[PDB]
């Protein structure tokens, strides 16, 4: 069917991201989809803040490790096994088809 | 007839749930339930459609018991003398041959039995298919 | 679905289908009585299943045994008598019937 | 900025194949036709993809023991950046010791776990007896 299922992955963790991308390409291969490159784009800094009871007159800086996976042969097994196997929290999965 | 049910099991998507053998067994069940309507006599009609060789051949069970109510299926515990039956229990006859496997109610009860058995089989399959993962995080 | 005038009726017994012919119309002479079946018609009853896995079944294996309903013309209750003539107007394109 | 930014784009294709197990030709075709990457010079992309030669696995075998983090738990991004940081003078030696080291550490500074370049530079001590043109 139509091709470009492009997955962005914001993240603040490291090992679970490797695990997630690995099992994602694993599922793509268990389907047969022409999985494109995960292509780890350059890490993006983020000055965070602490919106709780502050200090007296800290999650302030963090490094978002990003992932760009792509599935361009979505037969039944891709979406089936993907919606079946959930992914841990702490990562953002804003996907696109277009 | 037989060719029709073969075309069914060919078009049957869940061929693993019901290959030709159990397909035709369920169809013999459906044919017995149809003969239940063809005759006001409530007789167990095994057919043995000859799954792949040829067409069907209706039979008539004897339901071995000392009773005679509904005599189409009544034989005592030793009545096996003629026909060289020589069987006390299980001895069932083939007196009536070539009932209808093509009319309206035949095909309607065929549809009903097919959908019922297919849904039951897929349910029983998925039950164990997911029971495999007993002890894992599943959605829902 | 279209309307057919087949001889078979899904529910009624043998008596209610004894007067008709092989096509599904009474012979010319059957002394019918209020309640009997002149024709002989069935209708597509059901709707909204939307399971093509069963539509493929009942398109070849149940092609004409899917949505039956006996909206058949019965003689009104009370009027008896003898059938003496049967006219059949068939729309062109619609093929034919044996009695026609 | 044409041969410099070359490596920080081919590490992508390297990691991509490493996760995909496809052919390097496949991943390079898809990376090029994926985004028009001009930060890499085409021939230096060819050289970096030639940086999948068997000797690359060999530079994994040499620096194996003196790794402050074990092999079978290292991050794939770290695997790729390590292969490149050792291959910079396995055969190519386009720039001397300090230049290529700083190249690997900085042009791949935005891919690690906030500290990985520290320990890859620290393992580069084991890279000394093979990076001879100091």
From Swiss-Prot, chain C:
Name this polypeptide is given: DNA-directed RNA polymerase subunit beta
Family (UniProt): Belongs to the RNA polymerase beta chain family.
Domain of life, source organism: Bacteria
Subunit and interaction comment: The RNAP catalytic core consists of 2 alpha, 1 beta, 1 beta' and 1 omega subunit. When a sigma factor is associated with the core the holoenzyme is formed, which can initiate transcription.
Chain's role: DNA-dependent RNA polymerase catalyzes the transcription of DNA into RNA using the four ribonucleoside triphosphates as substrates.
Shown segment, full-protein numbering: 846 to 945 of 1342
